[PDB]
Design a protein around this ligand. Structure first.
Ligand SMILES: Nc1nc2[nH]cc(CN[C@H]3C=C[C@H](O)[C@@H]3O)c2c(=O)[nH]1
Length: 339
């Protein structure tokens, strides 16, 4: 049956018709990452320290915060950049995924317990629209899907887990793989699985980022100490492929680039879609191996364990900060609940 994400990705990358991993671009990105390796952008602390919307505390509240956001961590792109969902929070302005986090903090500050399953298990579509309200005329995408998943997720947390994601965390016994597995098996919307060449492959974008984010928000300590944190892969979404294609690590075929430039919508499980995700996932594994080797070849001792989580976080932010520079190669478009 099921290949795990890393195995899935290797298999996809090796049998890919429309997407290509370019060793030269793998080298480049590794070296761009090397010069940054001592800075907060490739430390676990950077998750809090570079993102003011992320929770400060390492408590049950923060953990449940990470849960609700990674539960809804899918599909923020809009049809045009002039015409998107924006949320204002404490006099600052956020679009995309950050507009979700703003929306959450905004609700918490209003006093609505949006990070509590007791609440979001029975929250209405009308309430959800309210909480996620935009400050432009344009709504966040798939709000109906965000409502349905909240209700399903809340119920399951209240029934199986005492209404707290901290309980799920503790049950994983400091294993990131077990936490990822528990999540995938307990919460339907996280089942980020499809087909390729007649084998079941897995990506687990949201499940993996949820584990990474649990790790980050608890600062790699306590219930968020994970002995096996380096086993987590990148989180295969639509932005990380874009920024790997920009930097020269990923190459797309004529036909694929055709779709991307015209804004033609991909479907979840389309081969080309699957190939982009799988190749991206494997691409990052290769950049990580390159970087570690470069760090070795300069006879160094890093001050923290570099892993595929941290590279992903970095490259995602890079995506965000350098959007204008990437116009030339668009991100692939899809509407699904998985990313
Ligand atoms: N691949 C990927 N997909 C994603 N969707 C949403 C996020 C949001 N994560 C944020 C927290 C730390 C990261 O630097 C990023 O600012 C994300 C990602 O960090 N990576």
């Amino acid at each position: 049956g099921l290949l795990n994400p890393r195995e899935s990705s290797k298999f996809i990358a090796e049998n890919s018709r429309d997407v290509f991993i370019d060793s030269g671009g793998v080298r480049r990105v590794a070296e761009l990452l090397l010069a940054k390796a001592a800075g907060p952008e490739l430390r676990v602390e950077g998750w809090k320290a570079l993102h003011e919307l992320n929770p400060r505390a390492a408590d049950e509240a923060a953990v449940n915060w990470v849960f609700v956001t990674d539960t809804l961590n899918f599909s923020f792109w809009s049809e045009q950049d002039e015409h998107k969902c924006v949320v204002r929070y404490r006099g600052k302005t956020y679009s995309g995924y950050w507009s979700l986090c703003a929306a959450v903090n905004r609700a918490l500050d209003e006093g609505i317990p949006i990070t509590s399953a007791s609440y979001y298990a029975t929250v209405t579509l009308d309430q959800v629209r309210n909480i996620l309200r935009s400050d432009t005329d344009v709504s966040m995408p798939l709000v109906e899907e965000r409502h349905r998943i909240l209700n399903e997720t809340g119920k399951i947390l209240l029934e199986k887990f005492g209404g707290s994601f901290l309980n799920c965390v503790r049950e994983s016994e400091n294993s990131a793989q077990k936490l990822m597995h528990l999540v995938v098996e307990s919460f339907p919307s996280y089942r980020d699985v499809t087909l390729f060449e007649g084998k079941r492959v897995s990506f687990y974008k949201r499940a993996q980022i949820l584990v990474a984010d649990t790790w980050s928000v608890l600062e790699g300590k306590g219930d968020g100490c994970f002995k096996d944190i380096s086993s987590i892969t990148m989180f295969a979404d639509y932005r990380l492929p874009q920024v790997l294609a920009h930097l020269g690590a990923l190459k797309y075929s004529d036909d694929l680039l055709k779709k991307l430039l015209k804004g033609e919508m991909l479907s979840y499980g389309d081969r080309q879609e699957v190939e982009i995700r799988g190749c991206s996932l494997w691409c990052v594994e290769l950049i990580r191996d390159c970087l570690l080797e470069l760090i070795e070849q300069k006879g160094e001792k890093p001050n923290g364990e570099i892993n595929s989580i941290l590279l992903d976080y970095y490259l995602w932010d890079y995506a965000h900060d350098h959007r204008e520079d990437m116009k030339g190669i668009p991100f692939h478009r899809i509407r699904c609940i998985y990313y």
